[PDB]
Structure 1
Amino acid sequence: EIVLTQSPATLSVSPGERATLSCRASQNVHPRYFAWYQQKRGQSPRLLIHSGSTRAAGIADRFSGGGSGMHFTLTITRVEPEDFAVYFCQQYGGSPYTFGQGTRVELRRTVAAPSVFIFPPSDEQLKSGTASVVCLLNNFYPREAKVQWKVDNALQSGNSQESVTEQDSKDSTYSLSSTLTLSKADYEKHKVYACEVTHQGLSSPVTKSFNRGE
């Protein structure tokens, strides 16, 4: 089986620049047996390149594929705002046919620090047996950001889930939410609830916190 590995994971580019996506096959693949797909948000995928380096039906002039063996590339001459999407590479020289994990092409802007907020579990929820502490990161670029929970100086793990918006249409930024869910029993056993955010736009990890019932 052939495993396709696309790099980079996220390709930060500006309208007009040149973009080169890569796909690292685990085994040698005939150059005529490779394909590329484009998928905008909320839409079905679309064929761009087939047979290695042949533009599909109605595909713009700027798109071009190529490569051989274990290294294949898809190149956009100058990118348009309509080219910001997820791109999948596919091989079909060996069974079974496989896709890459995908390469996200994003609009690159300047670095922006996250506005970190924090929310205590509502009384409506605590009266129902559960407790959810919410940590919010607002309008931050780039996408990379680490969030670690601390309850009384104790690191948390596995009991938190993260969710992040698509790149904003106005300012081209992101927004992330980290929800720490605890039972009402374990929530009352503690006092200090912290949320430590590590980001590039920050000189040092910011820590927002609150004391229960204060």
Structure 2
Amino acid sequence: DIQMNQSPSSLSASLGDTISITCRASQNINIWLSWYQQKPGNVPKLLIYKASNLHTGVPSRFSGSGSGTDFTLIISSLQPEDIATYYCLQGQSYPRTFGGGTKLEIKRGDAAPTVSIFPPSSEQLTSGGASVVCFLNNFYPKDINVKWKIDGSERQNGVLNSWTDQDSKDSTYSMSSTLTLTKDEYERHNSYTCEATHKTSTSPIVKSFNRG
């Protein structure tokens, strides 16, 4: 089996930049290498075939090269619509194998997350049916930490986290965190706090409310 090693697993760049993505085959695959683009929510699209041949609908800013085991995809003058994940594929031997992929992100100034906390809705409270939600929105860079405290005490049990892909409008990331309790336990406590720890500060951003 031929293994395809694709470097820059993740690549941060700026619009207009010239960037390159690499593909190393653990075995000579001649010219049988193609490149694909996949936008979030969409199906992969063929960019380059036979290592260096531009597919019919692909702009000239896309070019590929290489023979044997080393291949490179170059995007000159990065555009907003180019922000996506890129994969290489060897078509010489079975099984057919893809590269690990390269996820493009746009660089921007560091941003602290806007934090909002939400007590259980009355509907869920009838019942029952208790979920507390906290949004950590529009922050940069990617990594972020969330901590839940109930009446001071750290709670990790029934926590559910989700993360958005890079926002296309402002290049920021967001996170949703839902703490689910039983109606009974929720009503035995008062203070509920959501703490966000981001790169932008050694001090966590705290949001909370009283009564439950």
Shorter-chain-normalised TM-score: which range?
0.7 to 0.9
1:76-122 deviations in whole A, cap 9, x for unaligned?
12212331222122222332213234322222221111111111112
Cα deviation, residue 3, structure 1:
4.6
- Which residue number corresponds to residue 161 of structure 1? 161
Compared CA separation, residues 58 and 133, structure 1 to 2 (3 A): same
- Name 2:91's counterpart in structure 1: 92
Q: How does 1:173-188 map to 2 (within 5 A)?
A: 173-188=172-187
Partners of 1:67 and 1:195 lie apart in 2 by: 51
| Map of 1:47 onto structure 2 | 46
Structure 2 residue matching 1:185: 3-state secondary structure: helix
Shift of 1:166: 4.5
> CA separation of 1:82/1:168 partners in 2, compared to 1, >3 Å: closer, same or farther?
closer
Alpha-carbon contact 2:6-2:101 (below 8 Å) kept: yes
- Give, in whole Å, the separation in 2 of the partners of 1:43 and 1:64: 22
Unaligned runs of 5+ in 1: none
How many residue pairs are counted as aligned between the two chains?
A: 211
> For each residue in 1:13-71, what CA deviation from the matched residue of structure 2 results, as whole angstroms up to 9, or x when unmatched?
2111111223455x324242221101234433211112223222232222222346665
Q: Residues 11-160 of structure 1: matches in 2 within 5 Å?
A: 11-23=11-23, 25=25, 27-67=26-66, 71-151=70-150, 152-156=152-156, 159-160=159-160
The reply to whether residue 10 of structure 1 matches residue 14 of structure 2 is no
Q: CA RMSD in A?
A: 2.7
- Alpha-carbon distance in 1 for matches of 2:14, 2:144: 21
1:126 aligned counterpart, secondary structure: helix
Aligned equivalents of 1:189 and 1:71: distance in 2? 62
**Judging changes above 3 Å, is the alpha-carbon distance between structure 1 residues 78 and 168 closer, same or farther for their aligned structure 2 residues?**
closer
Q: 2:197, 2:71 → 1: CA distance?
A: 35
What amino acid is aligned across from residue 159 of structure 1 in structure 2?
V
> Structure 2: how far apart are the matches of 1:156 and 1:42?
31
Does the aligned pair in 2 maintain the 1:38–1:46 contact within 8 Å?
yes
Q: Secondary structure at the match of 2:81?
A: helix
Judging changes above 3 Å, is the alpha-carbon distance between structure 1 residues 31 and 140 closer, same or farther for their aligned structure 2 residues? farther
The amino acid that maps onto 1:86 is T
